[PDB]
Design a protein around this ligand. Sequence first.
Ligand SMILES: CC(=O)N[C@@H]1[C@@H](O)[C@H](O)[C@@H](CO)O[C@@H]1O
Ligand SMILES: CC(=O)N[C@@H]1[C@@H](O)[C@H](O)[C@@H](CO)O[C@@H]1O
Ligand SMILES: CC(=O)N[C@@H]1[C@@H](O)[C@H](O)[C@@H](CO)O[C@@H]1O
Ligand SMILES: CC(=O)N[C@@H]1[C@@H](O)[C@H](O)[C@@H](CO)O[C@H]1O
Ligand SMILES: CC(=O)N[C@@H]1[C@@H](O)[C@H](O)[C@@H](CO)O[C@H]1O
Ligand SMILES: CC(=O)N[C@@H]1[C@@H](O)[C@H](O)[C@@H](CO)O[C@H]1O
Lengths: 409, 416, 6
Amino acid sequence: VDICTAKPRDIPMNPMCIYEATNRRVWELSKANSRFATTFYQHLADSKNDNDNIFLSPLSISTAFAMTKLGACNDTLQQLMEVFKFDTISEKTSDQIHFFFAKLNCRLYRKANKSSKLVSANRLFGDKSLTFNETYQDISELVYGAKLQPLDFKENAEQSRAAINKWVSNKTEGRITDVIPSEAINELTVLVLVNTIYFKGLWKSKFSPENTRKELFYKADGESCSASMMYQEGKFRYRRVAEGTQVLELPFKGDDITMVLILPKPEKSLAKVEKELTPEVLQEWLDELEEMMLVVHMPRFRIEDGFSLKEQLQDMGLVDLFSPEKSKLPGIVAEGRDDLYVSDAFHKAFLEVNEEGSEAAASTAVVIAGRSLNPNRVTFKANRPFLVFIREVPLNTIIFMGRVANPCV
Amino acid sequence: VDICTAKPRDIPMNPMCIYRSPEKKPEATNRRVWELSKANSRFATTFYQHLADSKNDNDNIFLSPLSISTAFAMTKLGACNDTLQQLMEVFKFDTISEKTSDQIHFFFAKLNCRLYRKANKSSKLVSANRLFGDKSLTFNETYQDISELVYGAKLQPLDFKENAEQSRAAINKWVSNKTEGRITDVIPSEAINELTVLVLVNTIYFKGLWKSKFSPENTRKELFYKADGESCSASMMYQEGKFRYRRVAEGTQVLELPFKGDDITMVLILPKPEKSLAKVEKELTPEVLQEWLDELEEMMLVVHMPRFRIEDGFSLKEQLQDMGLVDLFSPEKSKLPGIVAEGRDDLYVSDAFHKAFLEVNEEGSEAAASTAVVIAGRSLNPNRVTFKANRPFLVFIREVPLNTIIFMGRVANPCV
Amino acid sequence: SEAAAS
Ligand SMILES: CC(=O)N[C@@H]1[C@@H](O)[C@H](O)[C@@H](CO)O[C@@H]1O
Ligand SMILES: CC(=O)N[C@@H]1[C@@H](O)[C@H](O)[C@@H](CO)O[C@@H]1O
Ligand SMILES: CC(=O)N[C@@H]1[C@@H](O)[C@H](O)[C@@H](CO)O[C@@H]1O
Ligand SMILES: CC(=O)N[C@@H]1[C@@H](O)[C@H](O)[C@@H](CO)O[C@H]1O
Ligand SMILES: CC(=O)N[C@@H]1[C@@H](O)[C@H](O)[C@@H](CO)O[C@H]1O
Ligand SMILES: CC(=O)N[C@@H]1[C@@H](O)[C@H](O)[C@@H](CO)O[C@H]1O
């Protein structure tokens, strides 16, 4: 059975608890994903210094929590529906959302042209001594291509953590190497749900390295660092808007996946734009872009971001799922454990931009019954940041999003 | 025999007369054309100082020294005696030590070859010379030939005796054409009559695009402070980037803005708000200007420069005369025997007119705006040097490899 | 910049 081709009934969804048409459904989900994206980004932004970098794949995070939702129940299940906005999809049963998410993934990673590389790989890691519910296992593999791999958490938390991080590294051409922090997984860890996404496109209009020059970049509080600024001249869908904010779209070969840069007018702060960000605000801009001859200056760079998702998500609505008391994930383990709750969830993203094109990768790991690690951190605030989006146009999906502030690498 | 690749021996000048320039007191280019470039500039600077001095501080000024040097160098071909000498002195051709007046022309052809390379370049720099003589007169064969061989000037016969006006309309049409319509009615109605036998004309036309773009989106209205102590609204172009710059004497700022191709650029001289431009002009010596140019160093700065159109026209007779060119204009003293054959050897220049045009803006086009600029990930030094041209300043458009001043002027009022 | 002279 191939879900991509299959129809609603052809796939026996048997979720334990509960709370063109396939195309308009998929779309509505893309909107739901977008909603979660900009909202999560704002919360994430409030936890960081306006001059720090921020990179993440909302899609990855949405996928890992959808996967997790397959065993959710009660409020836990409901809260999951609302926090990720799946509850805005014209449906009735919380279980139907999964079918369309599969449809989306299908269109996102399965195409003939493949002008640009965009792959995804999901997987589950359960303790070698437990008996996992068979429906949950079979449905996760079917809907999300996520097989359940055995791991000895009880006797080898570390072996396992390294094992998972390595599996992630393999699916991210080695750009994501430590999604899971050192002590995040312990003897009580029951399961770790993981998502990975890897992208690599070529500029439809590449830059000449001959036109790339070094340029002193001044960090807000401090001195400078050399930066490689690329230079190109040509026609691009562009648009200067309110308060002098510029919106520039850089399409990759194929035009199905593009990179949108957003920058405030010089001396005007970016924080104001972020606080007004919204799927519609963004759509508004995207609709106002016009073909125009322009000169584009843009740095050659790479940024890496990593963090816990627990904090942000709780503030957004996900409370139960992380509570050892209120969490309700009955549909996962059939026999072996019964008090399942998410101890933490980590994400890690990578973005590199050069003359040939761009490369991005991400991963989300939802750790069940592990040790809740205290929020990590790596501050190096820079200056004058611009927003970035790597989206798939036909599917209206924000694959990656972020704020580039330190073009010094 | 192509003059651009010819050896001096392949081009016989057979001049009617000769003058020996008295005894005096790099970079992979030709020694002689380099010296001629220096000469043209000495004339350029000097003549500009004179012209500006006779002009009110609130007036814009614009002209082409190269155009003038070329025309008179063309006229020198038939000059003799004191007319020949003065020509060599005023236009500083005599400062190319121990070189004879006829050798100047060979060097001038070589300079023109480089200048109007016409190669697969980006900026357009063209030139056109032409002699308009009366159909009834019989011009010197050597004069005719050399004017063509060295300066590419053909001899088109006109009927000044019967149809002077029709002849004037012909000349004007030619110049308008050679200047993409920017230079019209060069020759005044009054001028050109039944006694007119020769009208020598040189045209220079240039159009380039900025190598560093001035996005129209960033242009805004700002006050310009004229010499009369008043202000006016100007269109200010704005950008930040690296340009060859240098802070010289008494806080005067010198900035070079290159056009696509790097071969030609625009140099601006902006005195500190305190110092009046008249002073900088009075001190702008040929050797001083040269020092400044050599001191330019690439540097990150902010540029504030207005859009503007300048149209200047004037007679060169008076200025040139105060500078030493007298005989040429004297019906009694002029010596131009090498131009018209058989008699009429007491031929003199009745008048000499210059007309120049200059437009500066973002895209180079007078149309609306169709371009923009996006600079992502830039954070410059908060203490970067700033160049704000909201007061009178000097302007030059030069050919760097040769160090030739093609045009020059003063922007005393860019307002509308 | 566009300039011409005669
Ligand atoms: C094996 C087990 O624990 N029993 C339940 C079963 O009652 C339910 O029908 C199914 C649907 O998700 O989930 C589990 O299999
Ligand atoms: C000016 C010129 O063409 N040169 C010749 C000159 O060599 C010769 O001596 C003279 C007749 O005596 O005829 C011309 O002037
Ligand atoms: C002052 C004058 O008119 N006489 C001389 C003439 O004798 C001489 O042959 C000629 C050659 O250049 O130079 C002048 O014309
Ligand atoms: C809070 C709780 O455990 N009670 C309900 C239970 O009454 C119901 O039969 C079951 C079916 O999904 O869902 C549970 O959430
Ligand atoms: C290029 C342009 O538009 N300028 C025209 C040219 O097309 C025409 O050939 C010429 C007369 O021959 O007159 C010029 O003014
Ligand atoms: C046609 C004529 O008048 N003859 C003279 C000739 O004697 C002189 O040698 C030559 C050099 O310029 O110029 C010619 O015009």
